[PDB]
Amino acid sequence: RNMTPFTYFSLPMQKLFLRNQAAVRNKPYAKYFRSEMRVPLSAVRKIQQGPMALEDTLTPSIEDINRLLEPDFVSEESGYALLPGPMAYVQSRKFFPGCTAQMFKWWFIWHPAESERYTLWFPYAHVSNPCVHHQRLRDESLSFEERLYGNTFCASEYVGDRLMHLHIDFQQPASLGLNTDLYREAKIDGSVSALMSLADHPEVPVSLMVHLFKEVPDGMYLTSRYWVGAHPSMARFPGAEKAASLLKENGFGEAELETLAYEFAVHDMCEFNHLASFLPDLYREFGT
Amino acid sequence: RNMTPFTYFSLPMQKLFLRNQAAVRNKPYAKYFRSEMRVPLSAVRKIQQGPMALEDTLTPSIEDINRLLEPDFVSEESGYALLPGPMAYVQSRKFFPGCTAQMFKWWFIWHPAESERYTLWFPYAHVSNPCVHHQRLRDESLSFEERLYGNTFCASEYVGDRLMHLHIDFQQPASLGLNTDLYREAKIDGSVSALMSLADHPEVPVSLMVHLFKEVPDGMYLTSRYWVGAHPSMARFPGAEKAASLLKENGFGEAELETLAYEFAVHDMCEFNHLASFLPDLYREFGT
Ligand SMILES: [Cl-]
Ligand code: NI
Ligand SMILES: [Zn+2]
Ligand SMILES: [Zn+2]
């Protein structure tokens, strides 16, 4: 109920905004490109007084990720931390008023078609997000999962003041270690969970993301967990054992990853709440 | 006015907040140590979409700074830019509801006695600011100006994510190049204008700051100008010619200074609006 406009955007992100604003000007959906990004006051407040206590965090381990499927489990709204690994960690849960699973799935099919669409989601941070197999993405003979999974997206976007080039490979929840029986019993409507690698060495996973969406009568909740870095539990993913060295040889030490944890938390909060504010209207107008 | 809570504080600043929160716990003025920092929505929006047009900016030249003293001049609320120099530039104007000039002068004399007091002003960013002559601040044979001017303050505080150690030398407005007649005619109630240098290079001025306050029936306006960098017009200040080289040799290129210009704008907006939110209450209880 109490939303509040985000008030800070790094200098490079302000410049990106101006670039994106020029680019989207003559698009059919330009009216959806908006400068005010509102977030829940409660949620933003929770990430202004330091990292979470380690005891309340999760690792990418099988035990930890499956905690998300417990019937009595409901995620906190926000929070970030640095884990031994070293690894950045983010937890969140966003509400999408009036949004359905089908609309949310539509979004992931629709936006990659044009970079300018990707910029509606986060005007200040997003550059481009083309997938490798765009024909597969639009193939109606395939289920959502067959269209999206194993179809590397190459996201270029700022996280804080760092321009990143992330290769995002959406994956079946079960291949990520989520228990199928529990997942079914949790009645989850969809997943955009993925492995992520840096463009620098695309074959080395540096990240697991879990994103589970589930309808309520008044809309939809997205529960998300981000892990970016190195961790022994990541070894179940091919190439991941090389993460620690890759990270070190790039700039990613403990301090840099703790920073990234907070910046990811801000990014996640801004983009998903902003998407929630227009997605149902956008879908109605451009579902076509 | 439409005030809104500032939503972002850099990681190192969040950590400092906690240390500051613990240090202030047992102080009689602890109730004035507050996490929420509200700013004008109108002001903050003006610094979210890039730098100002150079045409609207000022240099620290004698001719330029005196424009601040023209009969019907009123500063815009906010704005930042990088000037040729290279030089970071910030303009602002803040309103202090129900605040008098005496209250504002008292703040400058009272807070430097204890670090904990300095933290009230900006809980997330301020570490300490002892001056060279602390006893001078309480000497009753001395005017506000006599207590402050030529009394070097060694401010340690975050600007953005950068911990800075700044030697602040408040000076008589005339000596910074402002016109006595214009000044008198403008009926300014006070100035906390200063030259600033880096603590590890105390004899090279890298900043001019102008801060002019004037009372009105409903409170007080504070007009502020920050210049941080190198510029030919700074040459009138002893040692200022060495700033270009000094900046080049430390971290400060064009990119760093343009960033610093935005982070200064944010810092200025937060601390001064926040001060405005409690100063009169603080004064009623602790003032003299
Ligand atoms: Cl493990
Ligand atoms: Ni495990
Ligand atoms: Zn994003
Ligand atoms: Zn300050």
Side-chain angles (χ1 to χ4, degrees):
Chain A
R1 277 271 62 88
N2 200 323
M3 305 296 288
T4 204
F6 214 79
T7 62
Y8 175 99
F9 302 105
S10 68
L11 174 61
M13 285 181 46
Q14 293 183 38
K15 295 181 174 187
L16 176 55
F17 173 87
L18 298 172
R19 279 185 154 251
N20 285 341
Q21 179 177 51
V24 78
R25 193 200 310 109
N26 287 140
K27 281 307 174 169
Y29 43 76
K31 57 191 174 181
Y32 287 89
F33 184 91
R34 292 157 196 186
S35 65
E36 195 174 71
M37 295 177 86
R38 299 193 164 255
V39 305
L41 188 57
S42 56
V44 73
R45 276 163 168 180
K46 268 111 76 173
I47 55 170
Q48 290 165 355
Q49 291 177 28
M52 300 165 65
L54 261 191
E55 297 69 47
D56 305 302
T57 61
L58 296 182
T59 69
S61 76
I62 302 301
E63 166 174 6
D64 289 354
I65 71 179
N66 280 280
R67 306 251 277 273
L68 307 173
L69 307 186
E70 289 168 347
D72 53 347
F73 170 88
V74 177
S75 174
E76 289 193 285
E77 271 192 292
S78 68
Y80 70 92
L82 170 67
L83 317 172
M87 179 168 267
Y89 174 66
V90 171
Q91 61 166 27
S92 66
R93 188 188 199 237
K94 286 79 58 172
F95 184 58
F96 291 66
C99 186
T100 59
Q102 198 182 325
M103 297 179 184
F104 195 69
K105 291 172 176 184
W106 172 86
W107 171 254
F108 280 85
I109 300 306
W110 184 86
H111 77 90
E114 303 179 297
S115 289
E116 300 90 344
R117 301 176 178 186
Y118 186 50
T119 77
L120 304 170
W121 196 352
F122 201 162
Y124 299 85
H126 288 167
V127 183
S128 58
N129 194 28
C131 72
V132 168
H133 303 285
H134 30 275
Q135 201 85 136
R136 190 191 298 160
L137 226 215
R138 47 180 166 250
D139 188 346
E140 281 149 1
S141 68
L142 305 177
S143 65
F144 174 77
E145 289 76 20
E146 295 175 293
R147 300 212 226 170
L148 195 63
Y149 299 173
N151 197 345
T152 301
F153 286 82
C154 306
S156 297
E157 65 185 325
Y158 280 90
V159 179
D161 52 38
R162 180 191 301 265
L163 178 54
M164 305 197 81
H165 301 283
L166 304 176
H167 282 42
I168 303 178
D169 189 11
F170 301 103
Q171 299 267 264
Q172 294 279 173
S175 79
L176 297 171
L178 287 170
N179 184 272
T180 298
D181 291 348
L182 298 178
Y183 186 100
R184 296 191 306 95
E185 291 162 27
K187 295 163 176 172
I188 295 155
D189 290 301
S191 168
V192 285
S193 312
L195 295 175
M196 204 162 56
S197 55
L198 318 160
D200 175 340
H201 276 101
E203 70 298 337
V204 176
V206 295
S207 171
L208 165 73
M209 284 179 298
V210 172
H211 290 293
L212 310 172
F213 52 95
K214 184 175 178 183
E215 288 178 352
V216 286
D218 282 342
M220 188 187 221
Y221 285 100
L222 215 211
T223 300
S224 304
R225 291 299 187 275
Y226 297 76
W227 295 274
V228 178
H231 194 273
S233 69
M234 291 291 289
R236 66 189 193 265
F237 301 119
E241 77 287 346
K242 291 177 187 158
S245 286
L246 181 65
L247 290 164
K248 260 181 273 197
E249 289 175 345
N250 293 174
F252 303 87
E254 288 176 29
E256 293 82 359
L257 285 166
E258 203 179 11
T259 296
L260 272 160
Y262 172 59
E263 299 298 341
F264 262 109
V266 167
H267 187 114
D268 166 69
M269 184 182 299
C270 292
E271 77 183 346
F272 280 114
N273 288 282
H274 192 57
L275 182 57
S277 77
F278 65 78
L279 178 53
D281 287 333
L282 181 74
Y283 174 86
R284 279 172 198 115
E285 186 166 358
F286 290 88
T288 224
Chain B
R1 306 169 294 160
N2 205 333
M3 309 295 286
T4 201
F6 211 81
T7 58
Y8 174 102
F9 304 99
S10 66
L11 177 66
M13 275 173 59
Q14 288 186 44
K15 291 180 162 171
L16 169 59
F17 172 83
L18 296 172
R19 294 192 299 272
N20 283 347
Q21 186 182 48
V24 77
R25 262 167 36 244
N26 303 130
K27 298 294 179 175
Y29 46 79
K31 62 184 180 180
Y32 291 107
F33 185 91
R34 297 149 186 186
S35 55
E36 187 171 80
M37 291 177 91
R38 310 191 88 195
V39 302
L41 186 55
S42 55
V44 81
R45 285 168 157 166
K46 296 314 289 187
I47 59 170
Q48 288 173 351
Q49 308 187 14
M52 307 163 59
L54 295 178
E55 292 73 30
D56 299 331
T57 69
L58 295 174
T59 75
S61 76
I62 283 164
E63 174 191 302
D64 275 350
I65 73 183
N66 274 294
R67 293 178 152 89
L68 299 168
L69 293 183
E70 287 188 357
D72 290 293
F73 172 83
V74 183
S75 177
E76 300 181 289
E77 283 195 278
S78 60
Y80 70 91
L82 177 79
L83 318 175
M87 177 161 268
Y89 175 71
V90 174
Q91 63 167 16
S92 62
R93 191 203 200 209
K94 285 82 55 177
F95 181 60
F96 291 63
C99 183
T100 65
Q102 154 66 3
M103 296 183 186
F104 193 71
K105 292 180 170 175
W106 170 82
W107 168 256
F108 277 84
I109 284 322
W110 179 83
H111 78 84
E114 304 183 299
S115 293
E116 296 79 359
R117 300 177 185 189
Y118 182 56
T119 77
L120 302 173
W121 198 352
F122 200 158
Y124 294 85
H126 288 170
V127 182
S128 57
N129 74 151
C131 62
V132 174
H133 306 294
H134 67 267
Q135 287 170 112
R136 201 179 291 180
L137 298 188
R138 281 179 77 111
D139 190 342
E140 63 185 58
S141 76
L142 305 183
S143 73
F144 174 71
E145 290 76 16
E146 287 175 290
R147 306 188 192 201
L148 218 66
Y149 298 170
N151 199 351
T152 312
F153 288 89
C154 310
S156 290
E157 68 191 310
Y158 283 94
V159 180
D161 58 20
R162 179 192 301 266
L163 175 61
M164 306 194 76
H165 305 282
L166 314 172
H167 275 21
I168 301 184
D169 172 28
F170 294 106
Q171 286 186 30
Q172 152 166 108
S175 316
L176 298 173
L178 294 162
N179 182 261
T180 305
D181 283 330
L182 284 183
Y183 193 92
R184 283 205 214 84
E185 290 168 6
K187 298 199 167 195
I188 300 307
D189 291 312
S191 168
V192 286
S193 309
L195 289 173
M196 212 155 40
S197 60
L198 296 179
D200 42 288
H201 301 273
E203 304 297 303
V204 182
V206 290
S207 176
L208 168 62
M209 294 187 298
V210 171
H211 296 285
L212 310 168
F213 50 104
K214 169 166 183 53
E215 301 186 332
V216 291
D218 284 333
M220 198 196 79
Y221 285 99
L222 197 242
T223 299
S224 299
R225 292 299 185 274
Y226 302 75
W227 295 269
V228 182
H231 195 276
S233 62
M234 289 290 288
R236 72 180 181 273
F237 303 118
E241 79 279 358
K242 298 170 82 173
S245 284
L246 177 60
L247 299 163
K248 265 183 292 209
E249 293 172 23
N250 285 219
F252 310 98
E254 283 90 343
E256 293 77 25
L257 290 168
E258 188 174 19
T259 290
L260 193 67
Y262 171 62
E263 303 289 348
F264 263 85
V266 170
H267 187 113
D268 165 71
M269 183 183 300
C270 286
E271 72 178 359
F272 279 117
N273 285 285
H274 192 56
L275 183 62
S277 78
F278 65 83
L279 177 50
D281 288 0
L282 177 63
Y283 180 81
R284 282 167 196 117
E285 185 173 354
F286 290 78
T288 63

